[PDB]
């Protein structure tokens, strides 16, 4: 069984490289962040440009939706995160306290907290309602590439250029587990599986790995793509067949069979590094986004 993703829309409008695309949980929007300091909102199904959200003073590396699809948080090189009301476009809060670029962000399922990772090598946990920093974790000894809550909000997984993935107890901020791989390649991305049992981790040696983190055991590895230079997002695609999806530095979208690790599709058409992919929560739809020589977002649709 293999998917058949085909290009359906190309979304242009960002004026520098795109950094991140995410589908709203209610399925109807795509948000995109860019080095052009902007967030844009698009219709998930027809690619209709909806709006631009502005106010960060420098570029944005990541953006994330609240559970109810009403808010976004963005992480910027201006050392802040910003919480936005999606419908109004207004900045509700500015989260200050990181001392360097903010690289990554996520809401917990409750969407009462935001977690962020920074070039300042820390992970911060923030109160959505007040915008105040609740915890600062000395999580790593190099820039933090990714942060993600598990399914119940009780855990955070972080990844860093120091080569480590760490699992943190959200409520206490204390480290529950460190995963080290073999030869400590920088870990450029990490996120829990939907069922909360695994973490999917990208390392800058052209490798994705599926780990059982309680056991500290690698269960699957995925290769064949080029990932040595950028922190490229990776996804569990669960709407049809169970795939692993990732951008690649060869301008392609790679899709792997989660179980057999075989490449099942390569999506051609971006003309620069595919820095970000996202999988639609209910339809077999992939959003992909590329760097400076492309600066567009592409939406692909499959029957499975």
């Amino acid at each position: 069984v293999k998917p058949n993703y085909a290009l359906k829309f190309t979304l242009a409008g960002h004026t520098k490289a795109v950094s991140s695309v995410k589908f709203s949980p209610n399925g109807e929007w795509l948000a995109s962040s860019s080095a052009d300091k902007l967030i844009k909102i698009w219709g998930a199904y027809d690619g209709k440009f909806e709006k631009t959200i502005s106010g960060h003073k420098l570029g944005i590396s990541d953006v994330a939706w609240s559970s109810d699809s009403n808010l976004l948080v963005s992480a910027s090189d201006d050392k802040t995160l910003k919480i936005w009301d999606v419908s109004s476009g207004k900045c509700l809060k500015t989260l200050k306290g990181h001392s360097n670029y903010v690289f990554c962000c996520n809401f917990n399922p409750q969407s009462n907290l935001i977690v962020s990772g920074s070039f300042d090598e820390s992970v911060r946990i923030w109160d959505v309602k007040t915008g105040k920093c609740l915890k600062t974790l000395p999580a790593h000894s190099d820039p933090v590439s990714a942060v993600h809550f598990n399914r119940d909000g009780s855990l955070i997984v972080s990844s860093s250029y120091d080569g480590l993935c760490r699992i943190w107890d959200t409520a206490s901020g204390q480290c529950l587990k460190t995963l080290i791989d073999d030869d400590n390649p920088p870990v450029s991305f990490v996120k829990f599986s939907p069922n909360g049992k695994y973490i999917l981790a990208a390392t800058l040696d052209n490798t994705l790995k599926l780990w059982d983190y309680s056991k500290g055991k690698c269960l699957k590895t995925y290769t064949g793509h080029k990932n040595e230079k950028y922190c490229i997002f990776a996804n569990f695609s669960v709407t049809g067949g169970k795939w692993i999806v990732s951008g690649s530095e060869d301008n392609l979208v790679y899709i792997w069979n989660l179980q057999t690790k075989e490449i099942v599709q390569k999506l051609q058409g971006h003309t620069d590094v595919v820095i970000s992919t996202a999988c639609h929560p209910t339809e077999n739809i992939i959003a992909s986004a590329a760097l400076e020589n492309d600066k567009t977002i592409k939406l692909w649709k499959s029957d499975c």
Binding site: A17, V18, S19, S20, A35, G59, D77, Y230, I275, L291
Partner: peptide
């Protein structure tokens, strides 16, 4: 920036 590699 995520869009830069150094």
């Amino acid at each position: 920036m995520r869009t830069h590699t150094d």
